[PDB]
Design a protein around this ligand. Sequence first.
Ligand code: SF4
Ligand SMILES: [Ca+2]
Length: 596
Amino acid sequence: RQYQVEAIDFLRSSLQKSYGVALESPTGSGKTIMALKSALQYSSERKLKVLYLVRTNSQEEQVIKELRSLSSTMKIRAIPMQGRVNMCILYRMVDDLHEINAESLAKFCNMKKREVMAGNEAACPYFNFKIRSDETKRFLFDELPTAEEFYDYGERNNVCPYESMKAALPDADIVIAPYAYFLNRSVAEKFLSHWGVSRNQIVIILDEAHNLPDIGRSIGSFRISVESLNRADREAQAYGDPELSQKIHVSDLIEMIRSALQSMVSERCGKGDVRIRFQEFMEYMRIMNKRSEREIRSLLNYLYLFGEYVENEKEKVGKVPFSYCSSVASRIIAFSDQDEEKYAAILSPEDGGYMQAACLDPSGILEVLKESKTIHMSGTLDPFDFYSDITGFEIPFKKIGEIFPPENRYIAYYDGVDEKELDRMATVIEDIILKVKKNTIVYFPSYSLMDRVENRVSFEHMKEYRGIDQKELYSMLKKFRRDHGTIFAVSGGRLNELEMIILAGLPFPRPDAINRSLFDYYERKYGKGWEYSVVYPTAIKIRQEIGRLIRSAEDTGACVILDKRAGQFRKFIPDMKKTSDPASDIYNFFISAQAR
DNA sequence: TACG
Ligand code: SF4
Ligand SMILES: [Ca+2]
């Protein structure tokens, strides 16, 4: 109700006079409706389309549900859009590649469609008149499936989801797409073109925008792994392993690359990840092979031209024209030409060994979004100054504070909590749990600590473990909402029903190379390394978790933070109490709330 | 100064 009116007003007027707007508003405030109504209002006046970017299928389904409602209220021409990597049914049938890209799939699809047009309808049996049928268009526009549901619909009806989405798109006013789809600039431009629209002509809603920095860093980062090298090696043998020069064959070049990477990892990586200089890869190359830099560069160029050859050979024989040689050479070459200030060259022994261009500053990647009107929504994004510096977005901001009765939520920190430190941490967690007897999830900073703590004990509990799983995460959540007690999980993972959360320590980031790189970056740039690389991400983590506790005026919930250093976060959690025995303090809180 |  009332919080929504003033937020919509603020969002609407802000768009007239700025390139975007940022709204913080708590969980349960209806961010997606506030954004939709503001954007639709604004866009109807000026004849613009609306693009809603989401990071996960869960954010996707939330938005698509809201949009389905409005559909009765008003006429809503919305579809999901995703690229061929997720929506092409055919290629995972005819091939099992371990890496893929959009361009290889365009070439592959276009060839399949030509074969179908030439009268070989079985070449791709998904490419048929149904792509443009009233049945298909009605299901998209009237049912408004998620991309997952539409893929499932497409399999069942023998019709291609990708092409169907693309055919409906000129007639969509609203598109729900992954950040990863739209922020791929190559893909983006084809996509705007099939939409029939310029960047000037859209309002983009950035769902859960507090992730925007990491979404930028992630799409801006790339790596070269040993395993990628190995797949290139195989590809080289299959395609003739030609001389690139001198008496250096493709496989020799690959061996040079791999052995350099392996030597770097063996000599440089101690405790874990380490930051190196970009030219160091080249140095190893030069010294191990007694070659100049210009000679190694020429060989890398020859390796890319070889990959071009492989893509061409694959294409003409009907395969997906993806080349690991091409993919590897372009990453090695880009790795060596990277902005030494905005990026960190990172060496890791993880996953068999890799080298990475870690994008430290996402403002560059995120900048194309300024060509559109943007709406940045999150529960978890003040101090805006921090967001602005980091994203490069200088736009009006409004915080909707608390909308729900403050007495229905108890947040506290306890300062009592090494091998003795664990035993205390466990004893403290135990009293709270056994004594309070309510549906709880305990968040740990690390899996190690989770395990270390998961004895002493015990009480029944479940664990968002190791490499869950996607499927298993659902069975787990569903268990927790019925035969329901205590869940353990880590702050990195994908996490009435939820009544308590216990933070077994503050989820500070690991002091690894990337994080130290980010610290150094923001320290050199703003003298705020600690604030931007440690404090702000941790506050965000904490609030996202707390935020799930109350999603209604009548919802009840407690959170306790088992950490001395928690008072430091009051400036992001201003209502937080200190406690000296949280067991009883919390216990008494739930009694009070039971009174009505 | 202060991150697992
Ligand atoms: S029509 Fe669809 S399924 Fe067939 S190749 Fe193209 S994208 Fe893949
Ligand atoms: Ca190519």
